[PDB]
Amino acid sequence: EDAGLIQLHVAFINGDVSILNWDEQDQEFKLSHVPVLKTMQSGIRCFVQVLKRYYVVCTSNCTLTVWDLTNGSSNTLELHVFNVENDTPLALDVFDERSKTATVLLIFKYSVWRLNFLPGLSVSLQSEAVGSFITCGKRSTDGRYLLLGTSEGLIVYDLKISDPVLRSNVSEHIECVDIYELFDPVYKYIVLCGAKGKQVVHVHTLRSVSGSNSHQNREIAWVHSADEISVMTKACLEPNVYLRSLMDMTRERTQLLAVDSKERIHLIKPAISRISEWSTITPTHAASNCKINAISAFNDEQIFVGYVDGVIIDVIHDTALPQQFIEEPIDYLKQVSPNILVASAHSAQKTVIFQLEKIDPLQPNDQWPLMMDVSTKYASLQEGQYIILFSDHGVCHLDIANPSAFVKPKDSEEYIVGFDLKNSLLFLAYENNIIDVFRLIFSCNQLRYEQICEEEIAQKAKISYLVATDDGTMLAMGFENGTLELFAVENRKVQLIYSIEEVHEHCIRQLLFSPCKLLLISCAEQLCFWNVTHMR
Amino acid sequence: NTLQQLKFYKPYICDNDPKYERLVNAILDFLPKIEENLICSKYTDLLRIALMAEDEAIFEEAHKQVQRFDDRVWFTNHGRFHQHRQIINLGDNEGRHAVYLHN
């Protein structure tokens, strides 16, 4: 208030590259006399300092400039900006305030700038390491603690004054669209609620024994074994067993974790892969040229597979490296057979023979991407065009492949499907609101009024899988872009549980089960607790 | 989606005991906590997650329904400290701008 001493005025800048002030103390606007002065060019984020004589101005060039209200217009202090190079092209971030009459607040990208009287360069703080920065929060009555973060589609961070501690937690995840976020004062009693991009609301209580749950848990893997459930998480191995709350924390900073068939530990290290009985010095050898994204292990001890950033694929304890002749690999898989088929980005399937070749693994069928499954004797190739079946001549080596069932489906084809066990039939289901069960034969698109096969009431994009099950019908799975449902071959029946809570399912959507032995069922997204569910 | 429900819950406790009373007082929790979904298609989670904090014999009385044949649901979904939540937002719908009232 520059008039009475009542109320806070409003001011902004039009496309006239001049400052515009509005004086409102009661009801309707006044605009007394002249603006008394203008502002050179235009900025983006502008606000008043602790003194009414000075106005901080921020432009789209991410620079710090100031035009004084009194004592001339443009004076000084364009000097010493920390970083002029943005991670992604944008404007300057939102300027903030403090409860102090001197110290002020600012945030720029991944860093937080706390400022003070005198030209600047006072306090610079960062909570921790990590997309583009858009949305940000703020607090007032709560003690002026600053809500912030790099991107944080999960676990938005809060910063307490002068201390690097996180008292806030997000179990609801979040999506990212708009900039709106804020927390209620709470009028006395304490608890918090806020809204964000997903158009939802988080409710949280800061009371707890320990924080720092951020980087410990993101995805979830599982130990392959027989009738034994052991789950793993981010930061490599965290021991977990049936009906036990015991948890240990050790971080070697793994990228993506896979598990062998036995108790042997298979893991990944930045820019290398490691295979060991237990992990101490973790011995290994690799000819790999660059960093590997993910690495996995078979059941049997024969060779290994994985997709690297480059041609070379490393193995351990075994000789006879793969033949390659492919740009970069995409989809891998596990087989107990000596021969292993591997999908590729060039969409040319590769035949890997153990400890020998005597064949040329060149099969450039189509330029449409391949993704494949297998039933028993037949290799099932699902392309971006049609689905073709191969007949294996032998488990030792694969030379010729006899075509059996190939057909061109309806427009807007389905991404990926799945098959049952101890059945080996033909199944083709359209992606939107319909699923059909067929017979092997040559090809059958016919259904008509003969019989009614299941139903699809939900799934549209990214249909996932399905598998053999107990007596009644068959089960389908996956949380991606929807939920999983249950239906009957000749009839309609009840369907299973919801996607647990959060959206954006983790990279591996596979469900943990034994087909005829099924008891426990484990499903989770990010921060979810023990997944154990059984039947009596 | 509730106050009416909720509004029922003040008067209609007319004759009951702490069993039923805290049962509702609890169930008040689900009311935010419950999620809007495919409606009743996926009715399934609600039943078993009513047992998260259990003063209730309800699901034990549901033993005459929840277990029936292969037609409706089978015994699954156990939980007992699973799925977290205590989440108050049931809407999936669109929005642009939002903020709290100062009062």
Side-chain angles (χ1 to χ4, degrees), chain B residues 81-99:
Chain B
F81 294 161
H82 186 201
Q83 294 179 336
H84 49 81
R85 294 181 182 175
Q86 186 64 259
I87 184 168
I88 191 169
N89 54 40
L90 59 82
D92 59 353
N93 291 283
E94 295 84 357
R96 183 181 64 196
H97 296 290
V99 67

mmCIF file with all atom_site columns, all heavy atoms in Angstrom, chain B residues 81-99:
data_model
loop_
_atom_site.group_PDB
_atom_site.id
_atom_site.type_symbol
_atom_site.label_atom_id
_atom_site.label_alt_id
_atom_site.label_comp_id
_atom_site.label_asym_id
_atom_site.label_entity_id
_atom_site.label_seq_id
_atom_site.pdbx_PDB_ins_code
_atom_site.Cartn_x
_atom_site.Cartn_y
_atom_site.Cartn_z
_atom_site.occupancy
_atom_site.B_iso_or_equiv
_atom_site.pdbx_formal_charge
_atom_site.auth_seq_id
_atom_site.auth_comp_id
_atom_site.auth_asym_id
_atom_site.auth_atom_id
_atom_site.pdbx_PDB_model_num
ATOM 1   N N   . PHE B 1 81 ? -2.347  -54.690 5.527   1.00 0.00 ? 81 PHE B N   1
ATOM 2   C CA  . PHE B 1 81 ? -1.249  -53.776 5.210   1.00 0.00 ? 81 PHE B CA  1
ATOM 3   C C   . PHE B 1 81 ? -0.752  -53.982 3.784   1.00 0.00 ? 81 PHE B C   1
ATOM 4   O O   . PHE B 1 81 ? 0.360   -54.454 3.548   1.00 0.00 ? 81 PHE B O   1
ATOM 5   C CB  . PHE B 1 81 ? -0.086  -53.928 6.199   1.00 0.00 ? 81 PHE B CB  1
ATOM 6   C CG  . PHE B 1 81 ? -0.425  -53.519 7.607   1.00 0.00 ? 81 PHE B CG  1
ATOM 7   C CD1 . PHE B 1 81 ? 0.347   -53.956 8.670   1.00 0.00 ? 81 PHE B CD1 1
ATOM 8   C CD2 . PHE B 1 81 ? -1.509  -52.697 7.865   1.00 0.00 ? 81 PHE B CD2 1
ATOM 9   C CE1 . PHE B 1 81 ? 0.043   -53.582 9.966   1.00 0.00 ? 81 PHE B CE1 1
ATOM 10  C CE2 . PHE B 1 81 ? -1.819  -52.319 9.158   1.00 0.00 ? 81 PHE B CE2 1
ATOM 11  C CZ  . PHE B 1 81 ? -1.042  -52.762 10.210  1.00 0.00 ? 81 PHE B CZ  1
ATOM 12  N N   . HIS B 1 82 ? -1.613  -53.612 2.841   1.00 0.00 ? 82 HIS B N   1
ATOM 13  C CA  . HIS B 1 82 ? -1.293  -53.611 1.421   1.00 0.00 ? 82 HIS B CA  1
ATOM 14  C C   . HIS B 1 82 ? -2.047  -52.450 0.776   1.00 0.00 ? 82 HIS B C   1
ATOM 15  O O   . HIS B 1 82 ? -3.023  -51.952 1.341   1.00 0.00 ? 82 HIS B O   1
ATOM 16  C CB  . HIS B 1 82 ? -1.678  -54.945 0.773   1.00 0.00 ? 82 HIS B CB  1
ATOM 17  C CG  . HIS B 1 82 ? -1.248  -55.081 -0.657  1.00 0.00 ? 82 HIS B CG  1
ATOM 18  N ND1 . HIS B 1 82 ? -1.834  -55.976 -1.525  1.00 0.00 ? 82 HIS B ND1 1
ATOM 19  C CD2 . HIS B 1 82 ? -0.268  -54.462 -1.358  1.00 0.00 ? 82 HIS B CD2 1
ATOM 20  C CE1 . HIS B 1 82 ? -1.250  -55.887 -2.708  1.00 0.00 ? 82 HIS B CE1 1
ATOM 21  N NE2 . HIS B 1 82 ? -0.296  -54.976 -2.632  1.00 0.00 ? 82 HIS B NE2 1
ATOM 22  N N   . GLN B 1 83 ? -1.568  -52.005 -0.382  1.00 0.00 ? 83 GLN B N   1
ATOM 23  C CA  . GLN B 1 83 ? -2.241  -51.008 -1.217  1.00 0.00 ? 83 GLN B CA  1
ATOM 24  C C   . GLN B 1 83 ? -2.249  -49.595 -0.635  1.00 0.00 ? 83 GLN B C   1
ATOM 25  O O   . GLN B 1 83 ? -2.737  -48.675 -1.292  1.00 0.00 ? 83 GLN B O   1
ATOM 26  C CB  . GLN B 1 83 ? -3.683  -51.440 -1.514  1.00 0.00 ? 83 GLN B CB  1
ATOM 27  C CG  . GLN B 1 83 ? -3.797  -52.688 -2.371  1.00 0.00 ? 83 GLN B CG  1
ATOM 28  C CD  . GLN B 1 83 ? -5.235  -53.091 -2.626  1.00 0.00 ? 83 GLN B CD  1
ATOM 29  O OE1 . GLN B 1 83 ? -6.131  -52.752 -1.857  1.00 0.00 ? 83 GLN B OE1 1
ATOM 30  N NE2 . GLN B 1 83 ? -5.462  -53.818 -3.714  1.00 0.00 ? 83 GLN B NE2 1
ATOM 31  N N   . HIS B 1 84 ? -1.731  -49.426 0.585   1.00 0.00 ? 84 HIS B N   1
ATOM 32  C CA  . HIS B 1 84 ? -1.569  -48.098 1.205   1.00 0.00 ? 84 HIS B CA  1
ATOM 33  C C   . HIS B 1 84 ? -2.857  -47.262 1.149   1.00 0.00 ? 84 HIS B C   1
ATOM 34  O O   . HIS B 1 84 ? -3.821  -47.574 1.848   1.00 0.00 ? 84 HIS B O   1
ATOM 35  C CB  . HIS B 1 84 ? -0.346  -47.342 0.628   1.00 0.00 ? 84 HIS B CB  1
ATOM 36  C CG  . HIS B 1 84 ? -0.258  -47.315 -0.869  1.00 0.00 ? 84 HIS B CG  1
ATOM 37  N ND1 . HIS B 1 84 ? -0.979  -46.437 -1.651  1.00 0.00 ? 84 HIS B ND1 1
ATOM 38  C CD2 . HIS B 1 84 ? 0.481   -48.057 -1.726  1.00 0.00 ? 84 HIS B CD2 1
ATOM 39  C CE1 . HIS B 1 84 ? -0.690  -46.645 -2.923  1.00 0.00 ? 84 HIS B CE1 1
ATOM 40  N NE2 . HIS B 1 84 ? 0.194   -47.624 -2.996  1.00 0.00 ? 84 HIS B NE2 1
ATOM 41  N N   . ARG B 1 85 ? -2.846  -46.197 0.352   1.00 0.00 ? 85 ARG B N   1
ATOM 42  C CA  . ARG B 1 85 ? -3.961  -45.253 0.222   1.00 0.00 ? 85 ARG B CA  1
ATOM 43  C C   . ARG B 1 85 ? -4.234  -44.427 1.473   1.00 0.00 ? 85 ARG B C   1
ATOM 44  O O   . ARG B 1 85 ? -3.354  -43.709 1.948   1.00 0.00 ? 85 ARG B O   1
ATOM 45  C CB  . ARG B 1 85 ? -5.253  -45.983 -0.166  1.00 0.00 ? 85 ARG B CB  1
ATOM 46  C CG  . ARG B 1 85 ? -5.255  -46.616 -1.537  1.00 0.00 ? 85 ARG B CG  1
ATOM 47  C CD  . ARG B 1 85 ? -6.599  -47.271 -1.799  1.00 0.00 ? 85 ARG B CD  1
ATOM 48  N NE  . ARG B 1 85 ? -6.649  -47.934 -3.099  1.00 0.00 ? 85 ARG B NE  1
ATOM 49  C CZ  . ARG B 1 85 ? -7.677  -48.660 -3.524  1.00 0.00 ? 85 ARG B CZ  1
ATOM 50  N NH1 . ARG B 1 85 ? -8.745  -48.816 -2.755  1.00 0.00 ? 85 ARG B NH1 1
ATOM 51  N NH2 . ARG B 1 85 ? -7.637  -49.230 -4.720  1.00 0.00 ? 85 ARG B NH2 1
ATOM 52  N N   . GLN B 1 86 ? -5.461  -44.535 1.984   1.00 0.00 ? 86 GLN B N   1
ATOM 53  C CA  . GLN B 1 86 ? -6.066  -43.514 2.840   1.00 0.00 ? 86 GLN B CA  1
ATOM 54  C C   . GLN B 1 86 ? -6.142  -42.263 1.969   1.00 0.00 ? 86 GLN B C   1
ATOM 55  O O   . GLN B 1 86 ? -5.722  -41.169 2.349   1.00 0.00 ? 86 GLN B O   1
ATOM 56  C CB  . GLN B 1 86 ? -5.270  -43.289 4.134   1.00 0.00 ? 86 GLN B CB  1
ATOM 57  C CG  . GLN B 1 86 ? -5.918  -42.339 5.137   1.00 0.00 ? 86 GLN B CG  1
ATOM 58  C CD  . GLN B 1 86 ? -7.231  -42.865 5.681   1.00 0.00 ? 86 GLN B CD  1
ATOM 59  O OE1 . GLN B 1 86 ? -8.306  -42.455 5.242   1.00 0.00 ? 86 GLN B OE1 1
ATOM 60  N NE2 . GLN B 1 86 ? -7.150  -43.774 6.646   1.00 0.00 ? 86 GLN B NE2 1
ATOM 61  N N   . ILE B 1 87 ? -6.678  -42.465 0.770   1.00 0.00 ? 87 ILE B N   1
ATOM 62  C CA  . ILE B 1 87 ? -6.706  -41.454 -0.279  1.00 0.00 ? 87 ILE B CA  1
ATOM 63  C C   . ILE B 1 87 ? -8.119  -40.886 -0.447  1.00 0.00 ? 87 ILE B C   1
ATOM 64  O O   . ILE B 1 87 ? -9.098  -41.627 -0.473  1.00 0.00 ? 87 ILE B O   1
ATOM 65  C CB  . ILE B 1 87 ? -6.182  -42.055 -1.608  1.00 0.00 ? 87 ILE B CB  1
ATOM 66  C CG1 . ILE B 1 87 ? -6.098  -40.999 -2.706  1.00 0.00 ? 87 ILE B CG1 1
ATOM 67  C CG2 . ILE B 1 87 ? -7.021  -43.254 -2.047  1.00 0.00 ? 87 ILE B CG2 1
ATOM 68  C CD1 . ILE B 1 87 ? -5.324  -41.479 -3.914  1.00 0.00 ? 87 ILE B CD1 1
ATOM 69  N N   . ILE B 1 88 ? -8.220  -39.562 -0.524  1.00 0.00 ? 88 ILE B N   1
ATOM 70  C CA  . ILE B 1 88 ? -9.517  -38.891 -0.466  1.00 0.00 ? 88 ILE B CA  1
ATOM 71  C C   . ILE B 1 88 ? -10.089 -38.525 -1.850  1.00 0.00 ? 88 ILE B C   1
ATOM 72  O O   . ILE B 1 88 ? -11.233 -38.083 -1.961  1.00 0.00 ? 88 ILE B O   1
ATOM 73  C CB  . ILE B 1 88 ? -9.409  -37.617 0.425   1.00 0.00 ? 88 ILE B CB  1
ATOM 74  C CG1 . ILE B 1 88 ? -10.782 -37.013 0.741   1.00 0.00 ? 88 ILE B CG1 1
ATOM 75  C CG2 . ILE B 1 88 ? -8.497  -36.590 -0.214  1.00 0.00 ? 88 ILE B CG2 1
ATOM 76  C CD1 . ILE B 1 88 ? -10.744 -35.947 1.815   1.00 0.00 ? 88 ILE B CD1 1
ATOM 77  N N   . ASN B 1 89 ? -9.321  -38.750 -2.914  1.00 0.00 ? 89 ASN B N   1
ATOM 78  C CA  . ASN B 1 89 ? -9.763  -38.326 -4.245  1.00 0.00 ? 89 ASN B CA  1
ATOM 79  C C   . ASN B 1 89 ? -10.319 -39.459 -5.125  1.00 0.00 ? 89 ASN B C   1
ATOM 80  O O   . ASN B 1 89 ? -9.605  -40.362 -5.547  1.00 0.00 ? 89 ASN B O   1
ATOM 81  C CB  . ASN B 1 89 ? -8.617  -37.574 -4.947  1.00 0.00 ? 89 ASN B CB  1
ATOM 82  C CG  . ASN B 1 89 ? -7.314  -38.365 -5.004  1.00 0.00 ? 89 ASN B CG  1
ATOM 83  O OD1 . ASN B 1 89 ? -7.301  -39.566 -5.235  1.00 0.00 ? 89 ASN B OD1 1
ATOM 84  N ND2 . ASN B 1 89 ? -6.205  -37.681 -4.759  1.00 0.00 ? 89 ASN B ND2 1
ATOM 85  N N   . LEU B 1 90 ? -11.626 -39.421 -5.368  1.00 0.00 ? 90 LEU B N   1
ATOM 86  C CA  . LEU B 1 90 ? -12.261 -40.466 -6.164  1.00 0.00 ? 90 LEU B CA  1
ATOM 87  C C   . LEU B 1 90 ? -12.390 -40.129 -7.650  1.00 0.00 ? 90 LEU B C   1
ATOM 88  O O   . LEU B 1 90 ? -12.704 -41.002 -8.459  1.00 0.00 ? 90 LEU B O   1
ATOM 89  C CB  . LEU B 1 90 ? -13.638 -40.797 -5.574  1.00 0.00 ? 90 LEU B CB  1
ATOM 90  C CG  . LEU B 1 90 ? -14.717 -39.712 -5.456  1.00 0.00 ? 90 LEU B CG  1
ATOM 91  C CD1 . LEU B 1 90 ? -15.479 -39.494 -6.760  1.00 0.00 ? 90 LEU B CD1 1
ATOM 92  C CD2 . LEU B 1 90 ? -15.678 -40.038 -4.320  1.00 0.00 ? 90 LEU B CD2 1
ATOM 93  N N   . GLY B 1 91 ? -12.150 -38.873 -8.017  1.00 0.00 ? 91 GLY B N   1
ATOM 94  C CA  . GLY B 1 91 ? -12.376 -38.458 -9.391  1.00 0.00 ? 91 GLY B CA  1
ATOM 95  C C   . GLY B 1 91 ? -11.238 -38.731 -10.356 1.00 0.00 ? 91 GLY B C   1
ATOM 96  O O   . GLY B 1 91 ? -10.066 -38.555 -10.021 1.00 0.00 ? 91 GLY B O   1
ATOM 97  N N   . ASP B 1 92 ? -11.592 -39.163 -11.563 1.00 0.00 ? 92 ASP B N   1
ATOM 98  C CA  . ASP B 1 92 ? -10.634 -39.299 -12.659 1.00 0.00 ? 92 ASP B CA  1
ATOM 99  C C   . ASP B 1 92 ? -10.711 -38.146 -13.660 1.00 0.00 ? 92 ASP B C   1
ATOM 100 O O   . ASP B 1 92 ? -9.947  -38.102 -14.625 1.00 0.00 ? 92 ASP B O   1
ATOM 101 C CB  . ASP B 1 92 ? -10.844 -40.634 -13.383 1.00 0.00 ? 92 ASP B CB  1
ATOM 102 C CG  . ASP B 1 92 ? -12.242 -40.776 -13.962 1.00 0.00 ? 92 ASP B CG  1
ATOM 103 O OD1 . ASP B 1 92 ? -13.100 -39.911 -13.688 1.00 0.00 ? 92 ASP B OD1 1
ATOM 104 O OD2 . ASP B 1 92 ? -12.482 -41.759 -14.695 1.00 0.00 ? 92 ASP B OD2 1
ATOM 105 N N   . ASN B 1 93 ? -11.635 -37.218 -13.428 1.00 0.00 ? 93 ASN B N   1
ATOM 106 C CA  . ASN B 1 93 ? -12.023 -36.256 -14.457 1.00 0.00 ? 93 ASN B CA  1
ATOM 107 C C   . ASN B 1 93 ? -11.008 -35.149 -14.737 1.00 0.00 ? 93 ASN B C   1
ATOM 108 O O   . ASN B 1 93 ? -9.966  -35.058 -14.087 1.00 0.00 ? 93 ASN B O   1
ATOM 109 C CB  . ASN B 1 93 ? -13.364 -35.618 -14.086 1.00 0.00 ? 93 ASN B CB  1
ATOM 110 C CG  . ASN B 1 93 ? -14.519 -36.595 -14.184 1.00 0.00 ? 93 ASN B CG  1
ATOM 111 O OD1 . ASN B 1 93 ? -14.997 -36.899 -15.278 1.00 0.00 ? 93 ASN B OD1 1
ATOM 112 N ND2 . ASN B 1 93 ? -14.973 -37.091 -13.039 1.00 0.00 ? 93 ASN B ND2 1
ATOM 113 N N   . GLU B 1 94 ? -11.337 -34.314 -15.717 1.00 0.00 ? 94 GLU B N   1
ATOM 114 C CA  . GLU B 1 94 ? -10.472 -33.226 -16.166 1.00 0.00 ? 94 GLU B CA  1
ATOM 115 C C   . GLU B 1 94 ? -10.520 -32.006 -15.250 1.00 0.00 ? 94 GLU B C   1
ATOM 116 O O   . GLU B 1 94 ? -11.482 -31.807 -14.507 1.00 0.00 ? 94 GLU B O   1
ATOM 117 C CB  . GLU B 1 94 ? -10.842 -32.808 -17.592 1.00 0.00 ? 94 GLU B CB  1
ATOM 118 C CG  . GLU B 1 94 ? -10.606 -33.882 -18.646 1.00 0.00 ? 94 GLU B CG  1
ATOM 119 C CD  . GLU B 1 94 ? -11.761 -34.861 -18.757 1.00 0.00 ? 94 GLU B CD  1
ATOM 120 O OE1 . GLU B 1 94 ? -12.728 -34.737 -17.977 1.00 0.00 ? 94 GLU B OE1 1
ATOM 121 O OE2 . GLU B 1 94 ? -11.701 -35.756 -19.626 1.00 0.00 ? 94 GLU B OE2 1
ATOM 122 N N   . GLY B 1 95 ? -9.471  -31.193 -15.314 1.00 0.00 ? 95 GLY B N   1
ATOM 123 C CA  . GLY B 1 95 ? -9.405  -29.946 -14.576 1.00 0.00 ? 95 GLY B CA  1
ATOM 124 C C   . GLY B 1 95 ? -8.263  -29.083 -15.082 1.00 0.00 ? 95 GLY B C   1
ATOM 125 O O   . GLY B 1 95 ? -7.355  -29.579 -15.749 1.00 0.00 ? 95 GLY B O   1
ATOM 126 N N   . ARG B 1 96 ? -8.305  -27.791 -14.770 1.00 0.00 ? 96 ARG B N   1
ATOM 127 C CA  . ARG B 1 96 ? -7.271  -26.868 -15.226 1.00 0.00 ? 96 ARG B CA  1
ATOM 128 C C   . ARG B 1 96 ? -6.634  -26.112 -14.064 1.00 0.00 ? 96 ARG B C   1
ATOM 129 O O   . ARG B 1 96 ? -5.442  -26.261 -13.800 1.00 0.00 ? 96 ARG B O   1
ATOM 130 C CB  . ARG B 1 96 ? -7.846  -25.881 -16.245 1.00 0.00 ? 96 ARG B CB  1
ATOM 131 C CG  . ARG B 1 96 ? -6.828  -24.918 -16.828 1.00 0.00 ? 96 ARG B CG  1
ATOM 132 C CD  . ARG B 1 96 ? -7.478  -23.964 -17.819 1.00 0.00 ? 96 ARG B CD  1
ATOM 133 N NE  . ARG B 1 96 ? -8.470  -23.101 -17.186 1.00 0.00 ? 96 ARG B NE  1
ATOM 134 C CZ  . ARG B 1 96 ? -9.389  -22.408 -17.849 1.00 0.00 ? 96 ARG B CZ  1
ATOM 135 N NH1 . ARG B 1 96 ? -9.445  -22.474 -19.173 1.00 0.00 ? 96 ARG B NH1 1
ATOM 136 N NH2 . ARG B 1 96 ? -10.254 -21.646 -17.192 1.00 0.00 ? 96 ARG B NH2 1
ATOM 137 N N   . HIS B 1 97 ? -7.425  -25.293 -13.377 1.00 0.00 ? 97 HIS B N   1
ATOM 138 C CA  . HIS B 1 97 ? -6.917  -24.529 -12.241 1.00 0.00 ? 97 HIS B CA  1
ATOM 139 C C   . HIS B 1 97 ? -7.642  -24.860 -10.941 1.00 0.00 ? 97 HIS B C   1
ATOM 140 O O   . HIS B 1 97 ? -8.841  -25.156 -10.934 1.00 0.00 ? 97 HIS B O   1
ATOM 141 C CB  . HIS B 1 97 ? -7.010  -23.028 -12.522 1.00 0.00 ? 97 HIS B CB  1
ATOM 142 C CG  . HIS B 1 97 ? -6.153  -22.572 -13.660 1.00 0.00 ? 97 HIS B CG  1
ATOM 143 N ND1 . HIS B 1 97 ? -4.776  -22.533 -13.583 1.00 0.00 ? 97 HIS B ND1 1
ATOM 144 C CD2 . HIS B 1 97 ? -6.471  -22.138 -14.901 1.00 0.00 ? 97 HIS B CD2 1
ATOM 145 C CE1 . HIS B 1 97 ? -4.285  -22.093 -14.727 1.00 0.00 ? 97 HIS B CE1 1
ATOM 146 N NE2 . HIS B 1 97 ? -5.293  -21.847 -15.545 1.00 0.00 ? 97 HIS B NE2 1
ATOM 147 N N   . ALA B 1 98 ? -6.896  -24.807 -9.839  1.00 0.00 ? 98 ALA B N   1
ATOM 148 C CA  . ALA B 1 98 ? -7.435  -25.112 -8.520  1.00 0.00 ? 98 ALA B CA  1
ATOM 149 C C   . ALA B 1 98 ? -6.609  -24.470 -7.408  1.00 0.00 ? 98 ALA B C   1
ATOM 150 O O   . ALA B 1 98 ? -5.439  -24.141 -7.609  1.00 0.00 ? 98 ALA B O   1
ATOM 151 C CB  . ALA B 1 98 ? -7.503  -26.616 -8.318  1.00 0.00 ? 98 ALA B CB  1
ATOM 152 N N   . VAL B 1 99 ? -7.224  -24.328 -6.232  1.00 0.00 ? 99 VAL B N   1
ATOM 153 C CA  . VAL B 1 99 ? -6.561  -23.796 -5.041  1.00 0.00 ? 99 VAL B CA  1
ATOM 154 C C   . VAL B 1 99 ? -7.531  -23.834 -3.849  1.00 0.00 ? 99 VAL B C   1
ATOM 155 O O   . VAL B 1 99 ? -8.750  -23.897 -4.029  1.00 0.00 ? 99 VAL B O   1
ATOM 156 C CB  . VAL B 1 99 ? -6.055  -22.340 -5.270  1.00 0.00 ? 99 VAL B CB  1
ATOM 157 C CG1 . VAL B 1 99 ? -7.221  -21.379 -5.439  1.00 0.00 ? 99 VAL B CG1 1
ATOM 158 C CG2 . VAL B 1 99 ? -5.119  -21.884 -4.156  1.00 0.00 ? 99 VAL B CG2 1
#
